[PDB]
Amino acid sequence: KMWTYMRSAEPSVFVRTTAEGVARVRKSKGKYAYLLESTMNEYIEQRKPCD
Amino acid sequence: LFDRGVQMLLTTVGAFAAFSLMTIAVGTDYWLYSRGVCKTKKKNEEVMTHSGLWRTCCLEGNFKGLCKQIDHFPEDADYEADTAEYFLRAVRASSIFPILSVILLFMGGLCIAASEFYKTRHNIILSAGIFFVSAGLSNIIGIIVYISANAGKNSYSYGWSFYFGALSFIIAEMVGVLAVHMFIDRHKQLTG
């Protein structure tokens, strides 16, 4: 179902970089959940503003 | 309390003082000092915000009098609709309790006018004590919700129209004590 959404939702939910996914999350106030490698996720969480 | 001849004047002047202070405070678009902005975008960076419940303003900025009326804004991961958060927002986003206190105290003023109109109705002055106490409750609950929101530090400090609103409670209690003396005088008159 998540794939069915992502393959059909617009504007295109996919991002070319983890920095872009992070930006889309932050712009969205958490209305967008970025799907990414755990190493990236737990790196970014340690980087300020740590939001 | 003796001097029953003057007590009617002393209670009516105390009640009118409370009413004037409360109505000036609720009319005034600022209550007590704090730091923040005058109006969002001293507009963004730094000014003493003269906060208030219904309306808010600022003092000693590079500009003054650009006051604001209360509103709300979204936050991360929402939680705006939570049983506590939505309750707090719905209470805080309204002038309910101070303006209800104003209305109750003004109707207390209209009540004590029945000392002269519809005269000799005696114990009807019972309603004045009710108005004083219910106005007091509305004032204190208003101040509680005001401070409870505002205290979240922003270096708050108490201001003139705040002092008016807070003092109106103690005035309303002293006036209530005199209004009870008036009532129990009317009771002793009815029972002879």
The data reach a resolution, in angstroms, of 4.3
Tell me the shortest Cα–Cα distance from B80 to chain A, in angstroms: 13
Instruction: List the single residue in B with minimal CA-CA distance to A32.
Output: B77
Say which residues have a Cβ less than 8 Å from residue B38's Cβ, sequence separation at least 6.
Answer: B47, B49, B57, B58, B61, B63, B64, B66, B67, B68
Residues of B in CB contact (< 8 Å) with A are 74-78
Tell me if B77 and A51 make a contact (CB, 8 A cut-off).
no
Question: Which residues on chain A are in Cβ contact (under 8 Å) with B77?
Answer: 29-30
Question: Which residues on chain B are in Cβ contact (under 8 Å) with A51?
Answer: 76
- For this PDB entry, the determination method is cryo-EM
**Is A45 marked within a binding site?**
no
